[PDB]
């Protein structure tokens, strides 16, 4: 059975854990320990293929960075600093992968919140500059969550 090794990165508080737990448990967590870093497993069918997702939810390991097959680079659309921080996460990934061609999806999380300070078009443009997709999500409503993870799988498959 095929396994896809995924790594979720981004600034503290953007919703890395909430996204991961929403995908695994179908539940929105309101106060998950910001320091807990662990890997989670889920069997899913994607485009007719039964596969295993092996997901590291990082909390700011070396093994997953080195052997991770794709990365969700997450910021929150109500957190300008987190968006600005994305560049540094992608630079770290390029250094470990020794490549500028790494399966990756840019995720703008917390799209349910009204205090938007990063416009969709800003993030689209960032993603275009990296040659990667941009997807908006809400870990709270579940909007876009499966799409983000499954798109990452589809990006790994093109690699
Ligand atoms: N409204 C809203 N809050 C969110 C969302 N995702 C995460 N949060 C909240 O943001 C805070 C940080 O989430 P968390 O998963 O711990 O972030 P992490 O540090 O990236 O793992 C928590 O209070 C979450 O409940 C979302 O999509 N919408
Ligand atoms: Ca290197
Ligand atoms: Ca390397
Ligand atoms: Mg966390
Ligand atoms: Na602005
Ligand atoms: Na690309």
Swiss-Prot record:
Compartment(s) of residence: Cell membrane; Golgi apparatus; Golgi apparatus membrane
One family from Pfam that matches here is Ras
The EC number of this protein is: 3.6.5.2
Modified positions (N-acetylthreonine) in chain numbering? 2
| Uppermost EC category | hydrolase
What membrane topology is given?
A: Lipid-anchor
Q: State the span of motif (Effector region).
A: 32-40
Instruction: Tell me the first and last residues of the signal peptide.
Output: none
Q: What is the effect of changing residue 26 to G?
A: Loss of interaction with PLCE1
Stored PANTHER family: RAS, DI-RAS, AND RHEB FAMILY MEMBERS OF SMALL GTPASE SUPERFAMILY
NCBIfam families assigned: small_GTP
Annotated protein name in UniProt: GTPase HRas
């Amino acid at each position: 059975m095929t396994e896809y090794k995924l790594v979720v990165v981004g600034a503290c508080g953007v919703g890395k854990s909430a996204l991961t737990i929403q995908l695994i448990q179908n539940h929105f967590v309101d106060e998950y320990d910001p320091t807990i870093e662990d890997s989670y497993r889920k069997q899913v069918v994607i485009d007719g293929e039964t596969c295993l997702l092996d997901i590291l939810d990082t909390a700011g390991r070396d093994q997953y960075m080195r052997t991770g097959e794709g990365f969700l680079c997450v910021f929150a659309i109500n957190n300008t600093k987190s968006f600005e921080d994305i560049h540094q996460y992608r630079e770290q990934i390029k250094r470990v992968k020794d490549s500028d061609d790494v399966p990756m999806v840019l995720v703008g999380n917390k799209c349910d919140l009204a205090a938007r300070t990063v416009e969709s078009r800003q993030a689209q443009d960032l993603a275009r500059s990296y040659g990667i997709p941009y997807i908006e999500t809400s870990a709270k409503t579940r909007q876009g969550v499966e799409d983000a993870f499954y798109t990452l799988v589809r990006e790994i498959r093109q690699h």
